[PDB]
Scaffold this active site. Structure first.
Site, short mmCIF file in Angstrom:
data_model
loop_
_atom_site.label_atom_id
_atom_site.label_comp_id
_atom_site.label_asym_id
_atom_site.label_seq_id
_atom_site.Cartn_x
_atom_site.Cartn_y
_atom_site.Cartn_z
CD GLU A 88 -2.98 -1.19 0.24
OE1 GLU A 88 -3.72 -2.20 0.13
OE2 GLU A 88 -3.10 -0.19 -0.49
CG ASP A 103 2.30 -2.47 6.80
OD1 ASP A 103 1.47 -1.55 6.95
OD2 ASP A 103 3.30 -2.61 7.53
CD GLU A 116 3.64 -6.02 13.68
OE1 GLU A 116 2.85 -6.75 13.05
OE2 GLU A 116 3.40 -4.82 13.90
#
EC number: 3.1.21.4
Lengths: 212, 209
Positions: free
Chosen positions: B77, B94, B113
């Site tokens: 994205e 993501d 993360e």
DNA sequence: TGGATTCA
DNA sequence: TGAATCCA
């Protein structure tokens, strides 16, 4: 203060109807979040709406927790408790009430969200793991609704922001409560910001006004 | 880089064994997180271990996502996509891979993360809601293990810190991957900190294909 | 916005 | 490690 939004899972609706002591705990939480008044000499809660993010929210949480502890006999984890417990899964659930509803020990855990949306996800997950581990029988989360959050600390969690995720609690007894001020205007003082905003003595005086 | 810890839910194990394309997407994620090398001239990943929290981690994520898009055709994205897709959910997953198979469209979503533990909880829940809504069929989360995180940015999420919560995903196809450097020593430069302590140019050069 | 950093 | 400030 008023409760304007609320979501109760089917499992919590069931539990609430059949368990008197669990229902009582829930009622005490509702009473504690509706009790706050402002100014302390008023009978309603008015929030100063002079500008975006102008008020703090932690003092309200402090008041709510103290009421539950001092008036309703809930237990709030103290810094010394947090220090010895948090090593593996993070800090313990902020506050809880425990009772022997004979044949077994039951507990209701609650957290008032005053951090950002990510911290609210962590809080909801902490409560969910507690339910899954049988450490609590009902979980409750309190949050300001969006209209009120606009005048609270920048980026604080609001009810509507966590709402899309309430469905992750379906299957477990969980309750989310969204509160709001009864009025908005510039004729009242600001709620102090920082966690030190209101001292442990100012909170007591405020609580005293709230209760009598 | 190496994968040293991993948790795969029973549902994910089942899905991986019966769905070849989902298994392929999973293998691409593993290949992409093992690909990183450091310095760029090495065939291995050595992390500088001279001081606590001395290295950044965002650049490793940037590299990983870039490899998946560039080499394996995943979609990450972009700023413009994020700008138009946010209401009350909090931003799209993501990166993801999509494919048609057996009369239905399937997707695998992943998030690396690099934020604090609260943000990892948000990420896991984002993925869980996507699974529940049928928008992805497998969710994957990557995190450095604790040994490595000691030398990465202060407060970053590490595998062992989220592990007590992996059980909140049981019943859904979910995978957690914990990665580590192959070596620790001072004879390497520090990985820069920040969304761009290392430029988009540098990351392009920092390939290893 | 998010990432990072530093003070409380 | 939360809060407030600052910039990649």
């Amino acid at each position: 203060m008023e409760v304007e939004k609320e979501f109760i899972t089917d499992e919590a609706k069931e539990l609430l109807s059949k368990d008197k002591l669990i229902q009582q705990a829930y009622n005490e939480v509702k009473t504690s979040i509706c009790s706050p008044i402002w100014p302390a000499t008023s009978k309603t809660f008015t929030i100063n709406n002079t500008e975006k993010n102008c008020n703090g929210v932690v003092p309200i949480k402090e008041l709510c927790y103290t009421l539950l502890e001092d008036t309703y006999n809930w237990y709030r984890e103290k810094p010394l408790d947090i220090l010895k417990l948090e090593k593996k899964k993070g800090g313990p659930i902020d506050v809880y009430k425990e009772f022997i509803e004979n044949s077994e020990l039951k507990r209701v855990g609650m957290e008032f969200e005053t951090g950002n949306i990510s911290s609210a996800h962590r809080s909801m997950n902490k409560l969910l793991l507690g339910l899954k581990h049988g450490e609590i029988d009902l979980a409750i989360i309190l949050m300001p609704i969006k209209q009120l959050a606009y005048y609270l600390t920048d980026r604080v969690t609001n009810f509507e922001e966590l709402e899309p995720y309430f469905e992750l609690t379906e299957g477990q007894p969980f309750i989310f409560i969204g509160f709001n001020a009864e009025a908005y205007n510039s004729n009242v003082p600001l709620i102090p910001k920082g966690s030190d905003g209101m001292s442990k003595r100012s909170i007591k005086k405020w609580k005293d006004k709230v209760e009598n």
